[PDB]
UniProtKB/TrEMBL annotation:
Domain Carboxylesterase type B: from-to ranges: 30-543
Protein name: Carboxylic ester hydrolase
Alphabetized GO MF terms: carboxylic ester hydrolase activity
UniProt family annotation: Belongs to the type-B carboxylesterase/lipase family.
Gene from which the chain derives: LcaE7
EC number, as in UniProt: 3.1.1.-
Length: 566
């Protein structure tokens, strides 16, 4: 990120702090939880809607001291009233704009928002799990403001969970009780809190919807796969990701030693001594060094992050992922709840700045062998069959004589989002009994209203609907502004939140009360479908054949002679 954008961001942070003061009312309120009373505050939005805000509700003990790298433990109850009128820290992470480490280990909190704490009817509860590659993100309202959802009669809950090595260290030695996935176990404990407490805020514990984008979509899917959460919620929405995406998990058990050595460890590679060192390290040091952990071999093999969700090496009481997610699909409780999945119309545009920094990446399109799924490729990627598979990828995405950056970004949309979604849909059809899955495609482009991800991708003046551009129409953020009622952006806010709320309520995303959706016939995907239909959200709402289908079929064709691996 440029120095000029860093300055603009600092200015926006200050202006946002004072806007939030002006949006705070003097009305506070007390609600009950199973652990004690909490005090929240009534806030306004720039549209003059209002909501009750409870931030910093603990769902677990702070994971500090001996609890570092462990599964979350239930919090200590309190007498009196806990102040929830301000946000807590985010999980330790490298700030996506400033490049400096920020946050705290004391980050296991959730926030609850509703326009009415004593409504006449129990409300759909929507639970948002943020993305950020399992290494960044937060539930702060400067990124995830509830201001648009609270226009309607729902309860919205935004959770945090541990990130990076603090959330995802994994050690093989059973005696140490660090099997992995602490950050997913945080999510489980938060969902249990929600089930047990949402009624105190006007919510219906029989009607909970979990949704998330990017790593939050992978997370939502994990929460639909694991036995730990069986029956805890009732609909799921996977926005640009799922648990079988290549980036969504990794076997990181050998990387703790590498991290320890980077942090000054002088001992041998055994889990006990490595853990002892990591338990004493400062958390900022571990998170800062994470970017150096992947080895030359792992970078060669396109491993994207050193620590993340993992297949746990031994079973524990709190185990989330006992097998690879593809195997978990076979028995997953969440296959039988209404599900909605979708992507944006130019996901891979997210890689714009990476391609500007490393333009030679376009040369990988000459043969495309490095994009062939690893389960199909020979180790050296020189076998004729592997070259043939790469040539199929190349034909799908290289549209002119010479490969371009846009061809590369189109390929990225497929390898990271569309193809895993196709594979998931097809696998899931073997392991469900008619429970509906609906597809959307977010295809609304504007730079009149933006979110901070555009800065991170250096996307000023860039046309196209990148990964994460839809979040602007779900959440207020500190770069947002009030839009006119008649504006295309305002209508998109109403449509996107409206569809999500309709789906959360009924398990069916269609409602004739959403403007522009009256003529929509939105059917769920059938196993017999050869071409997927989706609701495309542009300036209009239209059911269309997924435009990506032909390319999806070209990727699928690599498995014609390896169908057991598809």
């Amino acid at each position: 990120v440029s120095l000029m954008e860093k300055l603009k961001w600092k200015i926006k942070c200050i202006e946002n702090k004072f806007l939030n003061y002006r949006l705070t009312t003097n009305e506070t309120v007390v609600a009950e939880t199973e652990y004690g009373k909490v005090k929240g505050v009534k806030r306004l939005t720039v549209y003059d809607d209002s909501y009750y805000s409870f931030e910093g509700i603990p769902y677990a003990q702070p994971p500090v001291g001996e609890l570092r790298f462990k599964a979350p433990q239930r919090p200590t109850p309190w007498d009196g009233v806990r102040d929830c009128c301000n946000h807590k820290d985010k999980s330790v992470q490298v700030d996506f704009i400033t490049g400096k480490v920020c946050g705290s280990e004391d980050c296991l909190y959730l926030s609850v928002y509703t326009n009415n704490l004593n409504p006449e009817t129990k409300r759909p509860v929507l639970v948002y799990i943020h993305g950020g590659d399992f290494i960044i993100g937060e539930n702060h309202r400067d990124m995830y403001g509830p201001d648009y959802f609270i226009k309607k009669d729902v309860v919205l809950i935004n959770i945090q969970y541990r990130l990076g090595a603090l959330g995802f260290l994994s050690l093989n030695s059973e005696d140490l009780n660090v099997p992995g996935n602490a950050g997913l176990k945080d999510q489980v404990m938060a969902l249990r809190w929600i089930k047990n407490n949402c009624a105190n805020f006007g919510g219906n514990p029989d009607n909970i919807t979990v949704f998330g984008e990017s790593a939050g979509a992978a997370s939502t899917h994990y929460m639909m796969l694991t036995e730990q959460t069986r029956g805890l919620f009732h609909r799921g929405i996977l926005m640009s990701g799922n648990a079988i995406c290549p980036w969504a998990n990794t076997q990181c058990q050998h990387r703790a030693f590498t991290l320890a050595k980077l942090a000054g460890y002088k001992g041998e590679d055994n889990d006990k001594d490595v853990l002892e060192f990591l338990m004493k390290a400062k958390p900022q040091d571990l998170i800062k060094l994470e970017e150096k952990v992947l080895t030359l071999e792992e970078r060669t093999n396109k491993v994207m992050f050193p620590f993340g969700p993992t297949v746990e090496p031994y079973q524990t009481a709190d185990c989330v992922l006992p097998k690879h997610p593809r195997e978990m699909v076979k028995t997953a409780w969440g296959n039988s709840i209404p599900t909605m999945m979708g992507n944006t119309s130019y996901e891979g545009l997210f890689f714009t700045s990476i391609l500007k920094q490393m333009p030679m990446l376009v040369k990988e399109l000459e043969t495309c062998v490095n994009f062939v799924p690893s389960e199909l490729a020979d180790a050296e990627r020189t076998a004729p069959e592997t070259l043939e598979m790469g040539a199929k990828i190349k034909k799908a995405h290289v549209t002119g004589e010479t490969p371009t950056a846009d061809n590369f970004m189109d390929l990225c949309s497929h390898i990271y989002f569309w193809f895993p979604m196709h594979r998931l849909l097809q696998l899931r059809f073997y392991h469900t009994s008619g429970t509906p899955v609906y597809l959307y495609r977010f295809d609304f482009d504007s730079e009149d209203l933006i979110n901070p991800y555009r800065i991170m991708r250096s996307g000023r003046g860039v046309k196209g609907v990148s990964h994460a551009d839809e979040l602007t129409y779900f959440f207020w953020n500190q770069l947002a502004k009030r839009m006119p009622k008649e504006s295309r952006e305002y209508k998109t806010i109403e449509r996107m939140t409206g569809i999500w709320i309709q789906f959360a309520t009924t398990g069916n995303p269609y409602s004739n009360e959403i403007e522009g959706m009256e003529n929509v016939s939105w059917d769920p995907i059938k196993k017999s479908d050869e071409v997927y239909k989706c609701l495309n959200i542009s300036d209009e709402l239209k059911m269309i054949d997924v435009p990506e289908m032909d390319k999806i079929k070209q990727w699928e064709s690599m498995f014609e002679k390896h169908r057991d691996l598809f």
